[PDB]
Amino acid sequence: RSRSESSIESFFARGACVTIMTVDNPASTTNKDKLFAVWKITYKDTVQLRRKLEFFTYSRFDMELTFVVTANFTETNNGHALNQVYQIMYVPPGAPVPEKWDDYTWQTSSNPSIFYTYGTAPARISVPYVGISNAYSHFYDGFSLNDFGILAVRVVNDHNPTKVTSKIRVYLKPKHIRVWCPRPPRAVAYY
Amino acid sequence: GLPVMNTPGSNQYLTADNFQSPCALPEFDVTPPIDIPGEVKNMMELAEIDTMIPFDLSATKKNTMEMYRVRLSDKPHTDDPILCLSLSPASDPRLSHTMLGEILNYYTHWAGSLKFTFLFCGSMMATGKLLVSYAPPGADPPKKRKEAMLGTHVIWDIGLQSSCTMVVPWISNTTYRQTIDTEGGYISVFYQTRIVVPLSTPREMDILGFVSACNDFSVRLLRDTTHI
Amino acid sequence: GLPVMNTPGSNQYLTADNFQSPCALPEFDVTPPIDIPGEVKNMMELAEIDTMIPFDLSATKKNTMEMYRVRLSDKPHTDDPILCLSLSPASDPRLSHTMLGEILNYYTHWAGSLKFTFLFCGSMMATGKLLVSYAPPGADPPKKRKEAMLGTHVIWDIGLQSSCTMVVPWISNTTYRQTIDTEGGYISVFYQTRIVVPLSTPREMDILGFVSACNDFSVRLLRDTTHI
Amino acid sequence: GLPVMNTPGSNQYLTADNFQSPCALPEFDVTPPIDIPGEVKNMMELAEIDTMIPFDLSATKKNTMEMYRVRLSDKPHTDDPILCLSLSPASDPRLSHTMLGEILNYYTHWAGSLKFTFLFCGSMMATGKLLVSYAPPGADPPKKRKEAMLGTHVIWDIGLQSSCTMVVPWISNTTYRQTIDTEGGYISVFYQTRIVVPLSTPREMDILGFVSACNDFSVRLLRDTTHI
Task: Find chain B residues with C-beta within 8 A of D16's C-beta.
Answer: none
CA distance D197 to D195: 7
Distance CA B22, CA A65 (A): 10
Q: How many CB pairs under 8 A join B and D?
A: 52
Do the Cβ atoms of B24 and C16 come within 8 Å?
yes
3-class DSSP state of B176? coil
Q: How far is A71 from chain C (nearest CA, A)?
A: 17
C180 to chain A: which residues are within 8 Å by CB?
Answer: 94
User: Among C6, C9, C175, whose Cβ lies nearest the Cβ of A124?
Assistant: C9
CB contact at 8 A, D113 and D170: yes
Nearest to A129 by CA among C105, C175, B224: C175
Pairing verdict, β C205-213 and C70-72 = antiparallel
Q: Give the best residue of C4, C18, C23 to mutate against chain D (max D CB count within 10 A).
A: C4
Answer yes or no: do A120 and C180 touch at CB < 8 A: no
Mutate: best of A97, A99, A108, partner C, most C CBs <10 A: A108
Reported residue count of chain C is 228
3-state secondary structure labels for all residues of chain D: CCCEEECCCCCCCCCCCCCCCCCCCCCCCCCCCCCCCCCCCCCHHHHCCCEECCCCCCCCCCCCCCCCCEEECCCCCCCCCCEEEECCCCCCCCHHHCHHHHHHCCEEEEECCEEEEEEECCCCCCEEEEEEEEECCCCCCCCCHHHHHHCEEEEEECCCCCEEEEECCCCCCCCCEECCCCCCCEEEEEEEEEEECCCCCCCCEEEEEEEEECCCCEEEEECCCCCC
Q: Find out whether C107 and C177 touch, Cβ atoms under 8 Å.
A: no
Instruction: Report the sign of the C-alpha dihedral through residues B105, B106, B111, B112, in that order.
Output: negative
Q: Is A105 helix (H, G, I), strand (E, B) or coil?
A: helix
In degrees rounded to 5, what are phi and psi of residue D108?
Answer: -95, -50
How many folded domains does chain A comprise?
1
Q: How far apart are CA B149 and CA B167, in angstroms?
A: 17
Q: Which residue of D has its CA nearest to A10?
A: D27
Amino acid at B160: L
Indicate yes or no: CB of A92 within 8 angstroms of CB of B25: yes
Chain D residues interacting with chain C (CB cutoff of 8 angstroms)? 1, 4-7, 19, 22
CA A133 to chain CA mean position, Å: 21
CATH code (residue C171): 2.60.120.20
Q: Do A6 and B36 touch (CB under 8 A)?
A: no
Q: Does the distance separating the beta carbons of D29 and A2 come in below 8 Å?
A: yes
Q: How far apart are CA B136 and CA B152, in angstroms?
A: 9
D7 vs C contacts (CB less than 8 Å): 1
Q: Which residue of B has its CA nearest to A119?
A: B11
Measured CA to CA, the distance from residue C214 to residue A36 in angstroms comes to 43
In angstroms, the CA D49 to CA B128 distance is 71
Which residues in chain A have Cβ-Cβ distances shorter than 8 Å to B36? 58, 134-135, 180-181
Total count of domains within chain D: 1
CB-nearest partner of D1 from C3, C5, C19:
C19
- Using the beta-carbon criterion (under 8 Å), do A126 and B22 form an inter-chain contact? yes
Rama region for D138: left / alpha / beta (φ>0; ψ in -120 to 50; rest): left
- If you measure CA to CA, which chain B residue comes closest to A14? B16
Q: How far is it, in rounded angstroms, from Cα C91 to Cα C51?
A: 17
Q: Are strands A85-91 and A113-117 parallel, antiparallel or unpaired?
A: antiparallel
Residues pairing with B143 in the sheet: none
Which among B42, B47, B202, B196 is positioned nearest to B113, based on CA atoms?
A: B47
Boundaries of domain holding A76? 1-191
d(Cα B220, Cα D30) in Å, to the nearest integer? 9
Q: Is D13 exposed, middle or buried (0-12, 13-18, 19+ CB in 10 A)?
A: exposed
Q: How close, in Å, is residue B18 to chain D by CA atoms?
A: 9
C-alpha distances in Å from residue C22, one per residue of C19, C25, D2: 10, 9, 11
The conformation of residue A103, written as its DSSP 8-state character, comes to -
Query: In chain B, which residues have their Cβ closer than 8 Å to the Cβ of A127?
Result: 23-25
Nearest to D105 by CA among D194, D221, D228: D221
This PDB structure is determined at a resolution in Å of 3.2
C-alpha closest to that of A75 among A167, A165, A166? A165
Contact D31 B176 (CB under 8 A): yes
Nearest CA to B80 among B145, B151, B147?
B145
B92 vs B54: CA distance, rounded Å: 11
Q: How far is C18 from chain B (nearest CA, A)?
A: 9
- Indicate which of A3, A90, A136 best probes the interface with B, i.e. most B CBs within 10 Å of its own CB: A3
Q: Are B123 and B197 in contact (CB under 8 A)?
A: yes
Query: By C-alpha distance, which of D168, D18, D153, D175 is closest to D95?
Result: D168
- Listed residue (C177, C110, A178) closest to B33, CA to CA: A178
Domain span including residue D226: 1-228
Considering only CB atoms, which chain B residues are within 8 Å of C17? Answer: 22
Tell me the sheet residues that pair with B62: none
Please state the φ and ψ torsions of residue A10, each to the nearest 5 degrees: -75, -35
Which sign does the torsion angle of CA D88, D93, D94, D97 carry?
positive
Contacts of D19 in chain C (CB under 8 A): 3
Is B8 close to D19, i.e. CB distance below 8 A? yes
Chain B adjacent subunits, 3+ CB pairs under 8 A: A, C, D
* Nearest residue on chain D to B219, alpha-carbon basis: D29
Express the helix, strand and coil content of chain B in percent, nearest 5 each: 10, 35, 60
Residue numbers in C near B16 (CB within 8 A): none
Q: Tell me the C-alpha distance between D95 and D89, whole Å.
A: 5
> Which of A5, A180, A181 has its CB closest to that of B219?
A5
CA distance C168 to chain A (A): 22
Chain C residue with minimal CA distance to D6? C1
Neighbours of C177 (CB within 10 A): 24
For B21, the closest of A10, A58, A124 (CB atoms) is A124
Q: How far is CA D83 from CA B92, D70, D94, D121, in A?
A: 69, 8, 12, 16
Tell me whether residues B4 and C7 touch, CB distance under 8 A. no
Chain breaks in chain D following residues, C–N > 2.5 Å = 181
Q: How close B167 gets to chain A, by Cα (Å)? A: 18
Q: Dihedral, CA atoms, A115, A121, A127, A128, nearest 10 degrees?
A: -130
The residue in chain D having the minimum alpha-carbon distance to the alpha carbon of residue B1 is D4
Q: Are C188 and C86 in contact (CB under 8 A)?
A: no
Considering only alpha carbons, which residue of chain B is nearest residue A171?
Answer: B15
Q: Which of C186, C180, C61, C174 is nearest to C116 (CA)?
A: C186
Q: What is the 3-state secondary structure (H, E, C) of B131-172?
A: EEEEECCCCCCCCCHHHHHHCEEEEEECCCCCEEEEECCCCC
Q: Look at D5 and B2 and tell me if their CB atoms are within 8 Å.
A: yes
User: CATH number, domain at A104?
Assistant: 2.60.120.20
Mutate to test the interface with A, among C6, C7, C14 (most CBs of A within 10 A): C14
The Cα–Cα gap between D43 and D219 comes to 9
Q: Is A144 helix (H, G, I), strand (E, B) or coil?
A: coil
Contact flag B10-C17 (C-beta cutoff 8 Å)? no
Cα–Cα separations (whole angstroms), residue A19 to A37, A169, B51, B224: 11, 6, 35, 18
* Phi and psi, residue C121, nearest 5°: -115, 40
The answer to whether the beta carbons of residues A131 and A61 sit under 8 Å apart is: no
* Residues of chain B with a CB closer than 8 angstroms to some CB in chain D: 1-10, 14, 16-18, 175-176, 220-222
- Provide the Cα torsion A107, A110, A116, A121; round to 10°: 170
**What letter represents residue C93's amino acid?**
P
Distance from CA of B88 to the nearest CA of A (A): 20
Three-class SS string for chain C? CEEECCCCCCCCEECCCCCCCCCCCCCCCCCCCCCCCCCCCCCHHHHCCCEECCCCCCCCCCCCCCCCCEEECCCCCCCCCCEEEECCCCCCCCHHHCHHHHHHCCEEEEECCEEEEEEECCCCCCEEEEEEEEECCCCCCCCCHHHHHHCEEEEEECCCCCEEEEECCCCCCCCCEECCCCCCCEEEEEEEEEEECCCCCCCCEEEEEEEEECCCCEEEEECCCCCC
d(CA C193, CA B100): 73
Q: Is A1 exposed, middle or buried (0-12, 13-18, 19+ CB in 10 A)?
A: exposed
Q: Which residues contact C130 (CB under 8 A, 6 or more apart)?
A: C82, C118, C155, C156, C158, C164, C189, C190, C191, C192, C207
CB B40 within 8 A of CB A182: yes
